[PDB]
Each structure stands twice: as C-alpha cells, then as structure tokens.
Design a protein around this ligand. Sequence first.
Ligand SMILES: O=c1[nH]cnc2c1ncn2[C@@H]1O[C@H](COP(=O)(O)O)[C@@H](O)[C@H]1O
Ligand SMILES: O=c1[nH]cnc2c1ncn2[C@@H]1O[C@H](COP(=O)(O)O)[C@@H](O)[C@H]1O
Ligand SMILES: O=c1[nH]cnc2c1ncn2[C@@H]1O[C@H](COP(=O)(O)O)[C@@H](O)[C@H]1O
Ligand SMILES: O=c1[nH]cnc2c1ncn2[C@@H]1O[C@H](COP(=O)(O)O)[C@@H](O)[C@H]1O
Ligand SMILES: [Mg+2]
Ligand SMILES: [Mg+2]
Ligand SMILES: [Mg+2]
Ligand SMILES: [Mg+2]
Lengths: 373, 375, 375, 385
Amino acid sequence: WNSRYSYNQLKNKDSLIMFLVEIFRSLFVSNCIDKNIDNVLLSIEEMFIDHYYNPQHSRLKYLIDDVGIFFTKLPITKAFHTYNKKYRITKRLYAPPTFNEVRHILNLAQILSLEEGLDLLTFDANETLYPDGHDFNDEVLASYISCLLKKMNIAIVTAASYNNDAEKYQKRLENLLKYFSKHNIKDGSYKNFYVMGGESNYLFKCNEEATLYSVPENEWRHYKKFVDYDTVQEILNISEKCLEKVIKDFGLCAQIQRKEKSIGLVPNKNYMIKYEVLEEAVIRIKKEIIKNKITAPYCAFNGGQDLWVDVGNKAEGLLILQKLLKIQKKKCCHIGDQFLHSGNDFPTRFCSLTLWVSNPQETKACLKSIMHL
Amino acid sequence: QWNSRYSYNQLKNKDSLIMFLVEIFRSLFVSNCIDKNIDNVLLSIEEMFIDHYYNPQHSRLKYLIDDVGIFFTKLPITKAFHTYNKKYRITKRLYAPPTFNEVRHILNLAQILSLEEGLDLLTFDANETLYPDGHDFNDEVLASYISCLLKKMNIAIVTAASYNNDAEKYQKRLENLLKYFSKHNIKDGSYKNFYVMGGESNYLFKCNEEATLYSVPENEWRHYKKFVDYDTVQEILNISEKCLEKVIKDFGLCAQIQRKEKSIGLVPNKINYMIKYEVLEEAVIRIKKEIIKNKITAPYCAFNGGQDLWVDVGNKAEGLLILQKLLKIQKKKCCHIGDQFLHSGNDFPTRFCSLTLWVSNPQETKACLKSIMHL
Amino acid sequence: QWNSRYSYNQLKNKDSLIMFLVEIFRSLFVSNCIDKNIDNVLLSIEEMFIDHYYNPQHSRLKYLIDDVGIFFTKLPITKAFHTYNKKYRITKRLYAPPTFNEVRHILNLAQILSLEEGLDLLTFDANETLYPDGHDFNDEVLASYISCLLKKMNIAIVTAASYNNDAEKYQKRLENLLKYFSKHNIKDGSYKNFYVMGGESNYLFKCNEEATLYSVPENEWRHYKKFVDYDTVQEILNISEKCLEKVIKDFGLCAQIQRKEKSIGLVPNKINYMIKYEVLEEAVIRIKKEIIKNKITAPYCAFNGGQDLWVDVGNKAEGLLILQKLLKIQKKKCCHIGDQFLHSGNDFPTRFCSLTLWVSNPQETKACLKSIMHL
Amino acid sequence: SDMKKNIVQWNSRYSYNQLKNKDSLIMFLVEIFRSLFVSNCIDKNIDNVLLSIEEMFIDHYYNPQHSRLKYLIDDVGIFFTKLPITKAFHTYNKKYRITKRLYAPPTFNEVRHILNLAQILSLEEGLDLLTFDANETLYPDGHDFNDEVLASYISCLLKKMNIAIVTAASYNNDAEKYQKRLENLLKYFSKHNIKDGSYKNFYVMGGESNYLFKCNEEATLYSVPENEWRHYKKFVDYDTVQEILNISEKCLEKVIKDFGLCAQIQRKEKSIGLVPNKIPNYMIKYEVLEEAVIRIKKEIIKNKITAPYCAFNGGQDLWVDVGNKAEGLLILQKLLKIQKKKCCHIGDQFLHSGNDFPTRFCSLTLWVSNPQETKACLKSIMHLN
Ligand SMILES: O=c1[nH]cnc2c1ncn2[C@@H]1O[C@H](COP(=O)(O)O)[C@@H](O)[C@H]1O
Ligand SMILES: O=c1[nH]cnc2c1ncn2[C@@H]1O[C@H](COP(=O)(O)O)[C@@H](O)[C@H]1O
Ligand SMILES: O=c1[nH]cnc2c1ncn2[C@@H]1O[C@H](COP(=O)(O)O)[C@@H](O)[C@H]1O
Ligand SMILES: O=c1[nH]cnc2c1ncn2[C@@H]1O[C@H](COP(=O)(O)O)[C@@H](O)[C@H]1O
Ligand SMILES: [Mg+2]
Ligand SMILES: [Mg+2]
Ligand SMILES: [Mg+2]
Ligand SMILES: [Mg+2]
C-alpha cells in the first residue's frame, strides 16, 4: 500500500493524466485535433478495457509502468466529447490542452462508468467541502448531498482527528445536519450517513435529530486491521524525533503537536513554511518507518501549510465501510484534493473510484454531473 | 524591435534562464554533493554570466541557452546562492530538489547585488505587486519602505490600468500611498521625483506638493513616444475587437468587450464568471498573429493577466524607455518589479531595457525592497 | 544569403522536421491507433506542409517549429506514408515506435513524389553517397541509373574533394562511371549535360566526347562565384590552422594538418589511426565560433567528415547556385543527394536553394534513383 | 533477490520507458556530467562531485534495497564490489581528455567505458573466474577465432585464474564443432599452456547453460560428463521445453507474415532461431527483431510458463534458448566454488532483450562492443598486479 516512494514518482506529475496530455499534445500539433478523432480516442479506450481485464500484463502497463488498477470500463471517448462540446477546447490553435483539463476529462470518464450504479460516496471534508479549517457554509452543495443520500450511502472521511468527542465534529458540519433535519429526517436516508475521524479511527453515525454520535467500538473493531498499541506509539515517536531535526535543519517558525494515534507540526503565529520543506519531511518520515520495519497502516501527507502523521489510512476507512455495508469497490467513490504521492487521498485509488478536485466548487460540478445521470 | 516571436516553445516551456540553473542544481542534488563547497560550480556559472555581459550574441551561454535575455549588469550568482541558502537552507534537503521558484528568488537577489554601481530608477507594476488585483493600495508597511527609497532615487508607478487622463481616479487606486507621502516626503525634494504612468505608456502623471497626483500635459512628453496616429491606433483596436468577438463565439463565454481610447479589454460579469486560463492564452496569440497580418509595427501589447484580457496601444517597455530618456539615466541603473513576466504577461518586455525582479504577490515586493535597502 | 547560427538544443535533435513527425507518430503508436486509418492525422500534416509552402513566413508549421526551412514544393506526406508502410509495415509494430531514420526515408520519399512538375538538375555528394570514403567509383548498377538519368536532366557531381584543377585526379575517382558513359552516353549529347564541381564551389569540370573530364574555362563561370580575395581566403585558412593546432594539443591527437589553396583539413597519420568523432564535432564549433568572431563573411564551410575534418573557402550551397545560374535552372527544379545533413555537414546548406534527399550509403541512393526513375 | 525471482522480473517487468534508456545507471552519470559540462565547471577539479557519487556507490554496496541511489534510480542492479568511480574518471580522462570539450558533452558510450574501468579497478581483492561472450566480443559475428594478440592475453590470465566461454552458440554435443570456432585459441593454448596445469582451468559452455566442455591435455576440446554438473542446473520438463519452443516458433511465423521477410526458422532441441535468407545474406530490421523479442516474451507469460529462458537479439539473429547465461555462470560458480565478487563476464549484449543482461544479477560485468575493446579491458586487467 506504500513504500514504493521513488524519485521518478515525485518529479513527474501523474502517470495516467500526462499519458493523455502528451497524446492530445501531438494531436494538437498535427493540426488534426478538431477533426473526428474517434479512431484515436477509441484506441485509447480499447487499452483502458484491456487494463480493466488484465491489469498485470496490459499494454497500458507496458507504456505506463506505475498505473493504478482500473475498477470499471472507462468511456474516455464519451468523456472527451462531453467535455469538448461544453468548453470547445479543441477550437484552440496555439494553446495545447492542460493537465488540469485532462484531469477534468479523466474524472468525467469515471462518472459515466457508474452506469451500473453507485452504492457508496465519500468526501474529503477539508478543501473539497470548505477551505482549510473553515466551517461548512455553502448551502448550494448541501442540497446535492441530501438528494444523493436518498439513493445511496454518504460518508465523510477527513484526516482531521478530534479524538472521540462527537460534539466537536458538528461545528464542522452544523449547517449540513441542519439541511438533513429539514429533508432527510422525514426520509429513511439519514441512517445511511456516516462520518470518519482520523483517517480511519473515529466513526460516527447520524441520529434522528440530525446529530452526530459515536459508534460502539465492538461494531467495527473487527473490520479494522488490529494494530498493537505499542507499535502505534512507536510510529509517533519516530515522527516526533524526525520533525525536531526538520525544524532544526531548516530554522522555521513552527512546533510539534502530539495526539493519540496522530502527530503533526503546525506553524505558530501564521508564519508560512515552504512547500518543499514539508515534501522533504514526508519522505524523511517514510524512509525511517521503512528502516524500522513497521508494517502498520499509516500515512504522512503534505496538505496546505501543515504536516501530519496519522496511524490511520484514508484507504482503510473506505475499506471498513465496504466490509461493513457489504459494498463492492466497483460501486464506491471518493472525492479529495490530496491526490499527489505525498497526499492522503492517493491510497483510495487502491480500493475505490476517485475524483480529483482542487476547490469545493468542482465538487458541486462533480455531484451535479453525477445527479443528472 | 517588434516582439513578434510568438513561438510554441515560448508557450510550452518556462523561463529559459531559470530552468537552465534548475537542471544544474538538480544534478548537484542527485550527485549528493550539493551541501559541500560547490563554489567551483557556482564560479563557472558566474564566469558564463560575465562573458554574456560582454558578447551576448557569441557567448557560450547563448550557444547553450538560445533566446537568453540581455544582462545589463555583471551578475553575482555565487554570493546570491550563498546568502539565499543561509536563510532557507534548501541545500540541507535530501529528497526534494531545488525548485523553480527558489531559483527565481536567487536570480532576483543576484540582480539586486549587481547594483553596486547604484540605482537611479524603480518602477512598480501596480496590480498584483503593490496590492491584489482590482484593489486600492492599503498598506502602511510597504509605503514605509518606498518612502525611504524615494529620497535616494527616482521612483515610478508603471501600470497597465487605464482611466482616461483623470488624475482623481488614479489617486483613488493608491490613496494610502499618497497619504504616507504627505507626512514624510514633502519637506524633502523627493516629492518632485515620483511619477505615475497610466495606460501602458499613454497617461503620465506626477505628484503635487499637497500630495494629490496631478496629470502632466501631453505636449511635454509625447515627442518621446513613437508617433502612432489615431487612425492606426483604432485599427489595432478594431482588429482586436473582431478577434475577441470570435472568442466569445468560438467558446461559450459570458464576457463583455470593454472599449476605450487606445485599449480594448475582455471582462466577464457576475450573475464574476471565470474565464478559462487557456483561452486567454489562445486569444492573446490570436490578436498578436492577426496584427502582424496587417504589417503593423506600432508599439502595442496584448496580454492575459489574472482573469481578463486587455490590449493596449502602448508598451510597458516604452514607459520605462520614456522615463530613461526624460531623466537621462542609462538602462544599467533602471530596475522593474512586476508579476507578469511570462510571454503572455505585460511586464516581460522590460527585460529589453531594464533590470527585472520577478514577484508573485505584494509580500515578495516588501521582501525585495528590504534586501535592496541594506546596500 | 547568409549561413545561419545554431543552438546547442538544435545540435542535439538532428533534424527538427523529422523529429517533429517522430513524436507525433510515437503518440500515435502509444495511443494504439497507429495501424488504423490515420489519414486525418496525415492529411492535416499535409495541410500545414501546404500552408507553409504558400506562406513560409507566417505558417503554423513555422509557429510550432522555429527553424523550419523553405518548402520549395508541395510535399505529399500522406501518400509517402502509405508507400513506405506497404513495403516495411512499420505500423504493425506493437512494442517499438517508428524511428528517426524511418521518418527520414519517408521525408525523402515525400520530396521525391513532390517532383511531379519535373527535374532539371540532380547532384551527388561524391564521397560516401557514390562510394565509400576515399575509394574510386565501382558500381555498374548505380552507373546505369545515373546514365539513364543523364538523358532526361542535367547531372552534376558536387563534392568537397579538392584536387586543385587537373581533371586527371578527379577522373581516378569516377573512372568506372565515365567508361560506362562512353558505352551509352556518347551516341547522343548527354555527356554535355554532366558536371563535376571540385572543392564544394571552387573548381568546375565538364565531360568530353572521349569520356574524359576537362576543366571549364575560368571565364565561363567565374562571375557567379562571389569574389573572395587572397587576403580573406588566407585569413580563414590561418584562423582555422591555429584552431586545429590547439585541437591536436588538447586531446593529444595523432593527426596532421594539410594546407591547400582555398582549403585546409585535419587528417590522421597513416597506419589510419582512428580519431574521436566527438573531437571532430568540437573542432567544427571551435572553428565556426572563431570565424564569426573575426567578422569573416566570405562563403566558407567547416564540416565533419567520417574520419577527418576540413575547412573549405566555399560551400555546396553556393556551388549549386553557380550551376543554377549557369544552366538557368529554377530552385524548384533542383535536387541534391548527400550523406551529412547534420548542422556540421557540408551538405546541410543545400536546404536553402534545392530539394534534398538524405541518405547514408550508396545502397540507399539506388533506392532514391530507382524511385525517381519510376515516375 | 534470488536468481529465480530476477529472471521472473527480467522477462516480465520491462517497460517502454526503461527500454528507451539503454542503461539507467549510465544515464544517471550522463545527466550529471551533462550539467557539469553545461555549467562550464567540468574542466576544473571536480573531485567535489565525483567523490560524492562514490559515496552513494559505497552506501549501495552495503544497503542495496534502501539506499539513496535506489531512490534516484529505481532499477539499479546490485553492486558486488566498491566502484572507484573517481579514479576511473581520472584515469579515463587523462588519456582521452574529454573534459577539454567546450561544445560537445560526454556521450553514453564514454560513461560506459568509465564504468567498465571502475568495475575493473574494483577487483583489488583478486579475480578467480573470467568468462567471455564468444560471438562479436572474441571474434566478429559468425566467424572463427583468428586473432593472435587476444590469445596472448587469455593464456596469460589462464595461468592466474579460471577461464570460461559462455556463448549462445548451440552445437548439441559436437566438441569438434566448437573446436573449429576457437582452433587458433587452442593452438596457442597448446604452445604456451600445456606446460602449466592451466589447461584444466579452461571451460567452454554451449547452448546458453546446456552444454559444457573442458580442454584436454592434447589441446583438444572434449565433452564434460553430465553426471558431473547436471544437478546444479534447474531442471525443465521436456514438455515445457517444447512448449517454449513451439510458442516461440508460432510467433516467428507471424513476424514473417506481418513484415514481409526473407527469413527462415531454424528448429533445434532447446533452441529456436529466426535466421535470414541468403542474398542470391539479406538484412532484417533491428526494430523488427526488437519487436519480436517482446512478442516472444509477452506470449510466454500468457501461457503461464515460469521456466528460465532467454529471448535475445543477436544483431542479425533472433533466438530463444531454454536457459540463460546467468544460469550458466551459477553452474560454473557452483562447480569451481567461486564467489560472485571474484567473477567477471565480458559481453556485447547488455541491453534488455540482450544475451548477456542476466549476468548483472550474479557477477561483475564489462560492456564491450567489439574484440578491439575486449583487448583494452584485458590489458587493463593484466595491469592490476
Ligand atoms: O491528526 C489530526 N488532528 C487534527 N487535525 C488534523 C489531523 N490530521 C490532519 N489534520 C488536518 O485536518 C485536515 C485533514 O485533511 P483532509 O484529509 O483533507 O480532511 C487537514 O487540514 C490537516 O492539516
Ligand atoms: O485599458 C485598461 N483600462 C482599464 N483596465 C485595464 C486596462 N488594461 C488593463 N486593465 C486591467 O487592470 C490590470 C492592470 O494590470 P497591471 O497593473 O499591469 O498589473 C489588468 O490586469 C486588467 O485587469
Ligand atoms: O579541400 C579538400 N581537398 C582535398 N580533399 C578534401 C578537401 N575537402 C574535403 N576533402 C576530403 O574529401 C571528402 C569529400 O567529402 P564529400 O564532400 O562528402 O564529397 C572529405 O570528407 C575529405 O575526406
Ligand atoms: O541456440 C543457438 N544455437 C546456435 N546458434 C545460436 C543459438 N542462439 C543464438 N545463436 C547465434 O549464435 C550467436 C552466438 O551468440 P553469443 O556467443 O552469445 O554472442 C548468436 O548471436 C546467434 O547469431
Ligand atoms: Mg484535503
Ligand atoms: Mg500585474
Ligand atoms: Mg559525404
Ligand atoms: Mg555476443
């Protein structure tokens, strides 16, 4: 699930997205991008199916060595037409398609592949629902989530750990539960709504009063991979020792914060820390946990201007709900922003469909496209 | 010297000089020797930058990097890396290599230390470097750094914004700046050393002793400008507007065409609806390639900046060229500060006539000025 | 006309137009659609090759590739692809994309199929495209093609080989070709359409009724040669000679310098001790950068042969211009076959005044002539 | 890892990106030397950079799985010795003076030479077994041994260490047919080596790990009893050999129909080959041969065959052998009780889809282009003591 951290894996943006960018770029250069390129697009699709069936020996694997596993047949041809007709990006003559645009097309393809249905949908609460640290105050998208909960399960998986205090999480979602009591409380859908804490440590359901409450540990401790309490603390001690050198190596205005099953450094009044120092820290931390031969599920991610290390994994959270709610991976989806190799949403590619979002407005465009299907 | 070199390599690849240094530091990073005395590497890079100042078209640097700008000064790249590294210690990194923005600051500091001969003119890009885009200047810290520099040399505000000759609408954009000038820059003769250039090189302004900007007559400095008649200025507009109408049609865009004397813009409206960044690039080249189709050699500039497109019949290099001819200061002692230093930006042509400092936000301009004053 | 410069990036990728097609085909190969009906991609490429022929200054091909030369003819790249594909089926490859050299064969074929209007002059690099380096002509198959082609057009031998001005030396190179001309090309007047240009563009020779070369009177063709005086010729030789004498020292070369009137070169000692190809490519750029440093503007050429280096006062581009002005031949009716079309090769400047076929061995030239005869 | 795992990853975990760059480690040094040349500092004293490169090489000798070198280059081999890349650069540059170049950077082939020289200098602890790729490194492709100078070096080394010849040539068990390829070498061995006991130290391996021969006191080559060394080799069922041979054979037929080729299919026991038709020899495209090797490999895994094989490109030939040169080296290391640190191999096919590539998994390797380069190696090897 990790330990494949390579130099080449860091400097290059994305294996799959750039793969389509370079093909579109050459198509743009040959001046044939506006003509019917269905022959090219379907051959791209012909591979995506061959990678769905034989993901270990597909030709897509020979071209791109580090491809994730495809859980559905991706209609990349329909995804291009639908995105093209709306934005007319092919109408350009001097500006090639952008990595960001191909990520948009790739996300649309994963939505159309859900023609068989969708049983579970999860969100990365931070920066995909509301900016870093801010509270939920966008009333528009809350109507989308309420409608989808009527036809599927909705979960919130966010690396923010507030221990087991269920009351603290409501302040982050008070406006959301307010919309649930007005519509979902009459329906029978409110019980299908869950919230995950840490990355996979604190689970809360939803009561009849649109109130978040803790879940008995005996209801899902067997679904979670049991980890020695001594090993958990060791991971934090390895991290706490590593961050001190990081703050000592580069003189910076921050300090370390300790919790139960999670630690991270946060800049104090705040004085920003370079994006590369946080990148350096994740690889420093990972190489040490490798050196100590720790196999427990963990994660270290570079999100915004703070670094954290949790003894949970955002993929284990999806794995718990699937084993708990009797849901397959092919009918599971997750929306997040940290989809780089130093992000905590990347592990979700190993067990669920994924949608890469840069700001909460794109989640509105994501769910809006999902609904009209 | 028309900037007509619209090249696919200019759009596809970033700054030539910066990425040249990044790859070198990357090999120094990968070889594990970046934390040792790498002075032998840095000295040869300086040896190259020195010879480029002498033979810019036959240097080994121009053979390596074709399409280099021009070095108006001898650049101390060794001392700049030495002093940048001591503050941030990027070199103590083991798994993340030196990045693009880091070398951007190193080259900025390299240009700053090159002013051992002295500095006689500063220019500031108004929007995005002195205040956020579409805002009024609201900063007391920045104005305090500028005030001390105003006594040492002449300072100018060269912007791309255009209000037609109305000096009252310009002081509104930088109210708190004149307020600080009213307090500390009146007794000194520095009040007669501050300039403001609206449009792009079209509307020149100055400061009165009562600290409210006044517009300078046209007949005093219009002769320094390139003679562009009113008929050709409007065809550059007309051809542009015809191209923007195609852009509103070719792409579903909720955008308005703002027409003024000597300028055309592309602005959306809120129900603002954000235009795609890549269409802006596509439209800039459409306008430039269409103007050359009519053999128009008039100094113009079409640029995508922030969230809107504007085409001015002035040039932001002309503005710096005007002030160099007015105050009789060679290009060696003139420096510019802006955020639009890509091929699509409007601060780029100043590389042809003045030293340049690449900045992304107002906080870096304050960090720029603080280092420029400990000289 | 002037000989253009070079960037270190331009020295890497041998030909930009060829490389421009390779990366397109590679994305076609990568996308799994290479062996399907890809004519939309092919015809669109032809659309830019046509638009660059009609408007070479402002074309999208000029926009994407900055150093694109001049298309003297409409290039049928779509038919050339199908033709080369049907023979070798390079599109049936699944795990290896089409190569640089394969596109070279296609680009040559597209240039050949563009000659539907006709040819008036065909020229041959003598060394390495008619016979191995430094050998006498020995091939009857190839001789029949040149013989049959000498009936329908003019045929000239343009080689940088310099034997001053005695046709006996040049005949030893082309003995077996001239004896074949006696048996078939004398009953008619075809031998009066054969030429041999000595020393790139310094010596001219014609054929004679006895199947023997003679030197054309200097007055008959000297006015087209851009005059270069004894002083300027000797400055180029001396500036070069000084460079080679350092090139020998720095790398401890086992080689010698050979001086002639209007030419100088670096030859290995007899034993034939191999001399590094990298040092040869360096000696070109060392000399070229020195000649331009001394403001020399005369037509010269420093080229990197297989096992030696040579500098010649004159070049094959001017040599073709001499023949085109001699026989009143238009540019669009000219063609040249050579082996070194790298930027440091004496056949590269022909791109500026003729159509070109890039070959690497005498076997590849027969494939060109057989394809040319079958039209 | 274990050799069975390496062969599994070699014939099943290639990549288009990895097959583009010939060697990941040579390209590693080329990029660094490129920037050093681009930075203009490459002609000054650069022990600054080189020593740091050596430092990472040493850390990789001790910690191959979690080293900084393995971070930068994902697919590094395993270093059996400490490479003095600083001395190899000093030694190679003082001869050729490639740092005096101002407008031409060092090439892949030069860094390949420096890396060979570093591998040679790493043999300070001594050498006990030296093996040679026969075709194109001892004599041109398809020829017989007709070089006197080479025999003088090999005979001199034969007195000091064990010598072997691992080749892809596959004459079933006719030692007279192998003698014809090297008769001038055994002719020199008879004149200068029968006096020593060194002729017993000389071995020849046919097939690729299938046939073995030793030198007689009469300088003649004789077959080695299979009861003496069959056990060291991983056994392959007769049904699985012909399965490999047949699944390959079907592909060469498709390659001839796809691309119109004047070529034939030679069938032997434990070996198939795609050989070209005679001229009245025709030439087969290099990219087609490279294409078919991937075609062979891609289909063998589709049939879930895991036996050790080797599909390889021989310049003008395409062959598949049940067996590989890494297996043949293991058998000689198990036969003469020789550790990998004191064994070396010289060959020309060190690319992926190459004959001598699996040698990197169990020996020191020298990447040589022709017998003239083979001499420069053995000349530098003799200069050690
Ligand atoms: O251990 C935790 N305790 C409190 N906050 C955390 C913890 N881990 C991550 N965070 C922060 O909360 C957010 C969680 O990331 P997410 O996966 O995008 O929701 C980020 O802004 C983190 O900086
Ligand atoms: O002609 C003009 N009239 C009014 N606004 C303009 C004009 N030209 C540019 N602008 C806007 O004002 C900004 C000034 O750019 P800057 O001062 O160069 O950073 C531009 O980015 C546009 O948003
Ligand atoms: O100046 C000259 N005099 C005599 N031989 C020359 C001269 N210049 C070049 N050569 C040799 O003749 C060859 C002509 O090559 P070509 O131009 O490709 O025909 C060169 O590669 C040199 O070996
Ligand atoms: O199985 C085989 N039997 C006979 N000849 C072979 C066989 N395999 C390859 N060959 C040819 O013989 C050469 C010997 O290979 P090498 O000795 O490893 O260089 C190859 O390059 C092929 O041309
Ligand atoms: Mg997030
Ligand atoms: Mg700006
Ligand atoms: Mg030649
Ligand atoms: Mg071999």
